[PDB]
Design a protein around this ligand. Sequence first.
Ligand SMILES: [Zn+2]
Lengths: 207, 59, 145, 176, 38
Amino acid sequence: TKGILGKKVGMTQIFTESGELIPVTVVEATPNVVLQVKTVETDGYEAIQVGYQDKREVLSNKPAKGHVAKANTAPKRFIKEFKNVELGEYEVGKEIKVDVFQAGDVVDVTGTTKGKGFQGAIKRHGQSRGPMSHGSRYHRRPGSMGPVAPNRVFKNKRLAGRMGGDRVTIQNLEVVKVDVERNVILIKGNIPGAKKSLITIKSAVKA
Amino acid sequence: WIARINAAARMNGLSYSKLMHGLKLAEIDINRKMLADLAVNDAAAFTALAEQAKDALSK
Amino acid sequence: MRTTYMAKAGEVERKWYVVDATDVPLGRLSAVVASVLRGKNKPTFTPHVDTGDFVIVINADKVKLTGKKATDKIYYRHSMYPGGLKSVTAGELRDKNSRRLIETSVKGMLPKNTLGRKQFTKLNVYGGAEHPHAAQQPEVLDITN
Amino acid sequence: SRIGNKVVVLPAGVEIKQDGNNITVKGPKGELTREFSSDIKMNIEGNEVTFTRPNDSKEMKTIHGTTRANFNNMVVGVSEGFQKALELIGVGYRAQVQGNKLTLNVGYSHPVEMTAPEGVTFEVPANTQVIVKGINKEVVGELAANIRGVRPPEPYKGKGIRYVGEFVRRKEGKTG
Amino acid sequence: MKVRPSVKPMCEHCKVIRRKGRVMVICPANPKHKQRQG
RNA sequence: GAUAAACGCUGAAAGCAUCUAAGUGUGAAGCCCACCUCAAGAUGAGAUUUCCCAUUUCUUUAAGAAAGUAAGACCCCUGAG
RNA sequence: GCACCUCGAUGUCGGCUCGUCGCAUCCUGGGGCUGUAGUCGGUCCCAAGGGUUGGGCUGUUCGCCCAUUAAAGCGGCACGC
Ligand SMILES: [Zn+2]
């Protein structure tokens, strides 16, 4: 249903109208071009392709321009979809402004996490240390690989491999302001994402 | 050769052992190689032997 | 070394057969179908070459399960992860994925060579009553088996 | 099959339609349809009905008795109709009617409302007695069972919904 | 219920009832006699 | 949504009785969905949108070789979310 | 108990890290009976989804004790590693 992508700016504080400090993320948008309409007779779906930014025209290909040319806009970076929306109300080339989330206030936020390289088996999974003194030699290691009898290692004995870089929703957040002149939604809480990354913002599922 | 005799005998409505018993009642002593390649190639000869084996145990 | 036929790859013509499944049990349908695909009922074997045929199956759905086994023949899958046994099916596969019944109880009936793979991709199993394959002019068998 | 050798007489206004498994009984109130097995030979002959069948099966005799008993259910339900009657003891329990809903206040902190299908009426004269009428036996029994299950009785004071005549046998509780 | 591998009618009014591959004994007299091979 | 133990409605075999053989329901932190993620190397390798249009010699035309290209990509360079 | 198995060498108990499986079930969940008025209970049937604590005393297994908690389960995995 209500779906808007956008950037990620930073973290602020906003007094509410009873005088209470609340931490607030700052999420932008722009006008938002619908690119395709996917129906059951063509794809077996009901979905809508949307796209948010302005590239330079050096930085694209002819097929990107052949997508864009049915909506008469600039070629764009990010292209995603949205499923399970009662369509009507949507043509090739409309704009989905920031106004859709006035006080909807029950919203799922998705991003992609940061990236932290190779790290030890503690910092992923929270497995604890061994004793740092009384003569031991077992400071920061990932345990024992299992029993003896099966003559192998069972799957999922988790070990050292790269931290972060997958997409994570956070459910049921509120919305505070909508600044139509500046295209900014303000949200309570914390969002998985580094700065300048994408964020999808949808109406929540669990009512 | 038994498997090929199986298929070609089943084509003429005979199971794969009643040929054996009928051809020994008709007192015929063909090796299983020779019935195999006649069963592949000569349809007329294999149906002729099939009809005499039909006639043999028909008593 | 002397004279018996060893057929080549492009010597034996193939055909297309149509088999119903209205109220016949699984074992006997699968037995006749799996004896078709190796190249039996044709006097020109090799144990090398696909001398078999093509088999299309109509009305998967209406296959019997005799007596009980409507709720009893539990299939099992394990997922190579600890505790991962999934006995998710029963005789429920009559209702949903009735393709998936005959594609298991025929794959068991075949050898497990590479010919037990090239002889498996000649099945086509449809739960309904429609040929999408009418371009190839298939014939009809009669099962008194 | 002594029960499978009934003397069945059709009541005034009742016909028969035979189309395969269905046999329809239509009369002054209802038009019920069921299905019956093919080891059954139907019959002829206005208003007296019997069921002679190709007999000597294995268990020999279940089909006669059950069929049906089911035809007498058909005949009595289409011609006459059935009843099951309930009560309410356990002081302060109410039963009030707004059409096809039954507001039961059985002593919880919430009322209970039971709906109805098409061919089922209700009659509530007082604050205690609910009488369910209808056409089948199965449907009347299921609705009566659903009403009793809200609060079946207890063996100390005998609260809850009853029949007209349950033998709710009663124990004793000490005062401590 | 009483779940015992051997099952006997306790009272006069007991009746022996098969409901599955399963042997039941049920009184209307006492509820104490609901038995079952199990 | 379909079950487990437990409870029924109707009903006979057995003129009665009875939850079952025929028929027909209720019923759990459990099973399958519902929530989050990976996923067509699913060799059964899926679907949609948009972009691109031809020289030589013969081995003789066979899904032949070889060389320039298109759409596009890569190398090389300044870098970090 | 026996002595098949390993003497050109198959390293014991507890504790730490890490778990996983079975159910003859400790809590939570659904039930039948009661010598069940109520809140409490006793016994038996279904059920493995998750959870199942910190300290004092010897090297401890085992156990005694303090203070908590819905509960402070029994066992297999070379008496797991
Ligand atoms: Zn008794």
